[PDB]
């Protein structure tokens, strides 16, 4: 049996958790062996602008931040499992990617 990596990334831990729970509950609905939602290092896109247009006055900065949480899940590749994980809702603020290790 050959395995399937599912790399999924979001800005919302709760959507992320929703997807992982979908996968957990569907694998245990069936009996295929999950590999946990391995949490990968989350990316902190930091942008440190100066908050002034004038150029006059004291220099003050806005440190804006975007956070990307990332998980990966390995599940054995079955046609059933694959069909239904394709059927998954995959909400709007999330990306996924089903690679297959063979």
């Amino acid at each position: 049996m050959q395995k399937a990596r599912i790399k999924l990334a979001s800005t919302d831990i709760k959507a992320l958790n929703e997807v992982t729970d979908q996968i957990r509950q569907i694998a245990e609905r069936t009996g295929v062996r999950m590999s946990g939602p391995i949490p990968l290092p989350t990316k902190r896109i930091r942008i440190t602008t100066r908050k002034s247009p004038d150029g006059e006055g004291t220099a003050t900065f806005d440190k804006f931040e975007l956070r990307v949480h990332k998980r990966l899940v390995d599940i054995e590749a079955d046609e059933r499992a694959m069909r239904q994980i394709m059927r998954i809702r995959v909400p709007e603020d999330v990306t996924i990617e089903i690679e297959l290790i063979s």
Binding site: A9, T11, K43, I45, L66, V68, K70, E92, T95
Partner: protein, 193 residues
């Protein structure tokens, strides 16, 4: 294409869409949009307060609009549809724009502001604040804040709960800035019942 690139791209695109529609549907109480890239195409949903105005004359408006959408902005297959705000009187940018529209009609600012405040606080908001800033009452500019109810300013609960809205009223002699802030019926930390 890296993943953060993807997020950034989507946000920027959507922001520019939002800008365009804010310009063109300001009569309609355009509150915002949402966008989903379904397989058959990308379907978007415009939340506004007068879908009558956004459709115009038998879909004329949505038609030229979707043309603009797929052309000027990278979009697979636009599938515009329209929806309402469940409580626009709790939305605050729609109200800011309605107020600016009024001031442009020519209504006096105290009357318009107090009318809108009455409406919001009857439609059930815990608090409301309205700043009008500019050439009110002559040539030297001033600022006036009309407030009612209970409103927070500082902290994460403000950054989250209260809805902020801004608009310009472009009048004969210049701009009036309209800031609106609405606090709905939802609770804070130090309540402790």
């Amino acid at each position: 294409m890296a993943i953060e690139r993807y997020f950034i791209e989507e946000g920027v695109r959507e922001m520019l869409i939002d800008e365009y529609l804010e310009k063109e549907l300001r009569r309609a109480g355009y509150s915002g949009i949402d966008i989903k890239k379904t397989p058959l195409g990308t379907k978007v949903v415009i939340f506004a307060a007068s879908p009558g105005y956004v459709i115009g004359r038998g879909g004329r408006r949505i038609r030229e609009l979707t043309r603009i959408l797929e052309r000027q902005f990278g979009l697979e297959n636009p599938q515009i549809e329209v929806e309402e705000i469940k409580n626009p009187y709790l939305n605050a940018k729609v109200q800011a724009i309605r107020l600016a529209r009024a001031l442009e009609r020519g209504i006096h600012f105290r009357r318009a502001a107090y009318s809108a405040i009455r409406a919001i606080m009857r439609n059930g908001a815990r608090g409301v604040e309205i700043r009008l800033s500019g050439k009110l009452t002559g040539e030297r500019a001033k600022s006036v804040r009309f407030y009612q109810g209970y409103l927070a300013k500082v902290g994460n609960p403000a950054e989250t709960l209260v809805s902020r809205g801004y608009a310009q009223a472009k009048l004969k002699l210049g701009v009036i800035g309209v800031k609106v802030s609405i606090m709905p019926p939802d609770a804070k930390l130090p309540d402790e019942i």
